[PDB]
A paper describes a structure:
Protein arginine methyltransferases (PRMTs) are important therapeutic targets, playing a crucial role in the regulation of many cellular processes and being linked to many diseases. Then, another series of compounds (12a–12h) were designed and synthesized, introducing also an adenosine moiety and exploring the distance between the three groups. We also report crystal structures with various PRMTs supporting the observed specificity and selectivity. On the contrary, we were able to cocrystallize the compounds in the complex with both PRMT4 and PRMT6.
All six cocrystallized compounds (12a–12c and 12f–12h) adopt an overall similar conformation in the complex with PRMT4, revealing two common anchoring platforms, the methyl 4-hydroxy-2-naphthoate and the adenosine moieties, each one occupying the same binding site on PRMT4 regardless of the different linker lengths. On the contrary, distinctive conformations are observed for the linker in each compound (see below for details). On the other hand, the methyl 4-hydroxy-2-naphthoate moiety partially occupies the peptide substrate binding site on PRMT4 and mainly interacts with Y262, P473, F475, and Y477 on one side and F153 on the other side. Surrounded by such a “frozen” binding site, the linker of each compound adopts a unique and distinctive conformation stabilized by interactions with the protein platform in a region mapped on one side by catalytic residues M260, E258, H415, and W416 and on the other side by F153, Y154, and E267. Regarding the linker between the naphthylurea moiety and the guanidine group, a length increase from three carbon atoms (n = 1, 12a) to four or five (n = 2, 12b, and n = 3, 12c, respectively) brings additional van der Waals interaction with W416 and Y262, thus substantiating an increase in affinity and a corresponding decrease in IC50 values. If the linker is shorter (as in the case of compounds 12a–12c), the two guanidine-stabilizing hydrogen bonds established with the PRMT4 main chain are lost, and this may account for a weaker affinity compared to derivatives 12f–12h. In fact, longer compounds 12f–12h showed IC50 values in the low nM ranges compared to the μM range observed for shorter compounds 12a–12c.
Residue numbers in the entry:
A (entry chain C): 136 to 478
B (entry chain D): 136 to 476
C (entry chain B), D (entry chain A): 136 to 477
The structure:
């Protein structure tokens, strides 16, 4: 019941319906960097799986469990709450692994596992790492992890960097200005211009971009999944101090993430950086309401505060100022209403 | 309420959140054929509004009410269940129409209107006309219509026609065939190929197409909103008999719709046909899992059956056979998971 | 006889009937690259024929014997099992070479030659080099070759490369899909979908293609006809490891071949590569039933295994996997039912 | 058996291998005029099948049996000699007709049926109706037909007509003239020109043509399958007297056929005429060695003689003369080596 107490029923319904589609599973599977890196992380750390007990949190089609099986896992508990659980069972039988993979339909916060596991595996990451709040389910499942146990992924580093994108900033007002007309089919729309601007600026922009728009080395916030607690992700305060590498108008912050699989043999990384090939996580950009001018050598400092909501998302609050000028800007954004951009 | 008894709370939440965004209101407004045709229908039938009482069902930003006001409506009750009701009120004040347009926040099945109206106006059409099930709310609102009152739109014609599009058919099978692989990173996926094909073929394809793909004259199913009852739309049985004009593989049925605004002065049509400019309704195609071969001269007969569900959509059953050969295809589709091409 | 023990009578009948037609000999002679390269190989190595004894295995119309004669061969035994041996005799008379070219009707495994030869010549190559299994007759005929004799051709290189061709893959699955129909004139065909797909994908595709579809440098398997024995061609195991140069779906393997005529004066090559002008051998592609995704830098390894059958062809088994993912495709192929796509 | 005594094993092997492929079955099935007319003939004559015993000779995939089942047949014995019999069995199970369709693997001349049948159905027609000689198997199967029994098809009409096609005639010599060259890579080929011409002229041309090339109303030779005996098709003598409608050079005879399904309710026709849509039987044209000039009003008379051979085909002998001139021509053709021109 930890899941249903932090999540509106209306949101859980839609969430699980979405991951219940094969088309969606196929998308995730066809991302070769994602699928291949998970496989590489598990198989190259075979000693972390050989004759071990394994929990796969939100197994979907089962693919990560099959990898754990390839690596030599004695026993794998594959938990999945969507109707995809049925399809995972089918694959476990057709691949003759009924003696090693047990699919358990339900939420990991609600099901009973019969024993403690040596290692947990999952793909719980959303946009800017935290969105969809499955990282809480992943951490929750540590109640089943032996003390010496491991987690794959082991850590997550959400990166934050300032960007310049005059054209993105301008789009907002250009769109909002639809309403700034005194006779649209004889109707004066202009009283709504302000509300339109607000709405557009509350949407985090999900797409990719040229790394040339980044104005400073990114700042890293690390969650270590071995030590973290579920509750650590209810309120996430990310302080930042950027040392500006380029002079210009900073229109917002860009977000991406890495996770690392820290095994006994080696550490394997999965990156969603804009310097790396595009994943189904893209990148995320949050605009400031007002651009901040900064010179190369200036510091831009502030806080990104993420406050978990009952729609399995975050309210994002960003405050920033150029320390050498005192010019400051903010923005409050809702990751439950992202703008998926094609410009 | 009738609305909450026919609708899961989870679906209503999302539905009304979607229409609550200004960005979404702007997209509907910027469809010039939609906005312009509604305006033309109302203003050219000014006598249907001059000094009349009006109900606007699901008014959104209020745009249709403003049109009713331009046409000379004494009084317009604008009902809207999303938070857009707040923004509509703002526009009514800034346009100095507080004496003529009264916004009433809530569902039309739940609110109290103080009087009966002469005419109802709404844009309740979804994909394939019926999707989103607002046509029920529109019909429900007739409890407020005087005897001899009018409705704008007045009727809706659904059009059904068989199409050939080998490339469309192949896309879906090409996607589905992912699940045939016997060793995807060493994993045999092929036990799910059937489930994958079923799911993909249950998705109605929302996009446009050249009219050259149509293999017979369309068949028309008319709902007359003046006479129809809310419950008529719970189960909709559309029989069809196409006379094939071209020989080839029929890969599915294509759907579009017209509505007509039948006023005292003139009848104005809003069409979503593929012969007409593209609207935000596009057209919808339902693929058969297996094509049917037909020769020109052959008849293709069957039934399209639409059964309303609690997610404000329809489960669609399409059964079709080429009479001269007995070649038959049955197909089940869910308009709650459309494929946008 | 070695021939009739490795070949069903039904297959030999048809094989020899096919090469017995003048129309078929004209088609082979009109391939100028084939005819011209054979001529160039023989004439430019004239010292390999001047005053030498020659065996032409499966001479057909006789054309290669005439070339050996132009080069100065003392004596040429031209063996041919089809009825074309009589048309070859006619040409030997009309060209006043009765003193130098002796046609011997019959199979080279069955006839008696009166002496040993200095050199053997033949065109025994089929699709993918080996099809029709005449390479065995060519190797069998070495019982007539002196120690230190030569073979023309001398070696054969089979080239294997991975290819991407989505449109090819689609045409065959579109054909196969006929058998998914639940109501073809009211009859449910779909229980045979699996079998139809198998059948279609077992057909090697004989045509040409742009070299741009190739996703890695080809791999070479060499048969040296001087050293090889007839029995070596009963089971042919071709290992391969491709280093992928491009990322994408690998829909199969493409095959072609070169033979080299290694004479005393020079080596002349006859290539059927897609970089070279088209011959009557074209190229051959074997499709995988399921494509393999590979990234550039990945290795694609496996085996092409050819097992000779009694219908003068091979049962081909192709096993390939992307080493970095363990994605694997196994495919069977029957060279006796090729799909001609040109 | 009657089949193996009239057929060389080499030929039977290949024949049955060819019809054993699903790809080939699919081709036959996708010809809508063939498949649809068979269906229409059986269902419109439902009273010929309701609660009746049925034999389907060479059922292939089974499609005609399924039609007999749709029409209400109590029991259908579906005989098929190719490995397609296996696939037909699979379809009978997947269509829940194991109680009504019994697939019997083997040749209809060799298998045991447990009872006599009311009606036989088959698609035994080849090029010019008779080619491949399955019409003999169809007639052979009458040993299983009750006295009142019927046959579908019931009759076959072969149509013969004189044609003009200067360009077709010319092609032959243009091809043959490959050999009429004194130095093809230094070899004199010309001694073979005669033999090449002969070979080309012995090939019946399988393709279609504009009906405007026909110079007289066609002449009809009818086989009634109810009365005919297997041996009647060993030697088929077709006399003809054409009354010329157009003046010009007659370069040969064009052949096509109709079969009729004569039921109790109605007669349904399947035509392969050039006036009708193209089928997988096309039409067949046999050239004269020398064109015959005829004026409109002249009569062109002669005989077409078909003599069955052991390669499941016919040797065709055509003799024709213009009666008013005494200008005569001849031609011996072999339908076992047809030229596909389409
Ligand atoms: C109007 O649209 C929007 O505005 C909108 C907004 C958005 O944010 C959007 C985000 C999108 N997502 C997206 O791109 N993802 C990337 C894919 C990788 C993540 N894969 C993953 N996390 N798999 C988890 C598996 O774990 C299961 N699971 C979870 N919790 C569990 C629990 N407690 N117990 C048991 N099993 C559990 C779950 O069922 C599933 O199988 C896509 C569309 C969007 C549209
Ligand atoms: C992943 O993507 C999917 O899965 C998906 C699936 C889909 O099906 C999608 C469908 C889409 N539809 C769409 O673009 N339509 C445009 C047609 C024009 C507007 N049509 C209409 N009816 N206006 C309603 C107005 O009337 C109000 N209203 C309704 N009911 C009321 C009641 N009872 N009382 C009072 N007011 C009420 C309502 O709030 C609003 O103002 C778009 C996206 C999709 C995505
Ligand atoms: C749908 O169609 C199919 O299914 C199919 C299947 C296929 O595989 C096909 C293959 C095709 N091949 C083809 O175009 N090749 C041309 C390349 C030239 C190779 N030259 C060659 N082989 N000539 C040997 C000569 O040497 C004689 N000879 C052989 N053995 C002998 C022996 N032991 N003793 C004495 N004489 C012997 C022989 O008679 C002949 O004169 C064409 C069509 C196809 C269609
Ligand atoms: C070397 O290339 C050439 O030069 C060549 C020369 C040619 O002449 C060619 C002719 C071609 N033919 C062709 O296009 N036909 C189209 C019409 C098909 C008619 N349908 C049919 N005949 N069905 C027979 C069914 O009846 C079964 N069956 C027969 N006898 C049986 C028996 N005794 N017992 C039991 N079952 C028996 C049989 O297995 C099958 O299922 C094609 C290629 C050619 C190439």
């Amino acid at each position: 019941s930890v899941f249903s107490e932090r999540t509106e029923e209306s949101s859980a319904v839609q969430y699980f319906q979405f991951y219940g589609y094969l088309s969606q599973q196929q998308n995730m599977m066809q991302d070769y960097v994602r699928t291949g890196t998970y496989q590489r992380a598990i198989l190259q750390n075979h000693t972390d799986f050989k004759d071990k007990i394994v929990l796969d949190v939100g197994c979907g089609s089962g693919i990560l469990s099959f990898f754990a099986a390839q690596a030599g896992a004695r026993k794998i508990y594959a938990v999945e709450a969507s109707t995809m659980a049925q399809h995972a069972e089918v694959l476990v039988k057709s691949n003759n692994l009924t003696d090693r993979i047990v699919v358990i339909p339900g939420k990991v916060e609600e099901v009973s596992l019969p024993e403690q596991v040596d290692i947990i595996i999952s793909e719980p990451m959303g946009y800017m790492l935290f969105n969809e709040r499955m990282l809480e389910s992943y951490l929750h499942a540590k109640k089943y992890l032996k003390p010496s146990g491991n987690m794959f992924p082991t850590i997550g580093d959400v990166h934050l960097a300032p960007f310049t994108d005059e054209q993105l900033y301008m789009e907002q007002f250009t769109k909002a200005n639809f309403w700034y007309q005194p006779s649209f089919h004889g109707v004066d729309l202009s009283a709504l211009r302000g509300a339109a601007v607000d709405e557009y600026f509350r949407q985090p922009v999900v797409d990719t971009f040229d790394i040339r728009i980044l104005m400073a080395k990114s700042v890293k916030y690390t969650v270590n999944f071995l030590e973290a607690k579920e509750g650590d992700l209810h309120r996430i305060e990310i302080p930042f101090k950027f040392h500006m590498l380029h002079s210009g108008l900073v229109h917002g912050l860009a977000f991406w993430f890495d996770v690392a699989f820290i095994g006994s043999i080696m550490t394997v990384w999965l990156s969603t950086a804009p310097t790396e090939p595009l994943t189904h996580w893209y990148q995320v950009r949050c605009l400031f309401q007002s651009p901040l001018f900064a010179k190369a050598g200036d510091t831009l400092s502030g806080t990104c505060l993420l406050i978990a909501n009952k729609r399995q998302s975050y309210d994002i609050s960003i405050v920033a100022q150029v320390d050498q000028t005192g010019s400051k800007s903010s923005n409050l954004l809702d990751l439950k209403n992202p703008f998926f951009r094609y410009t």
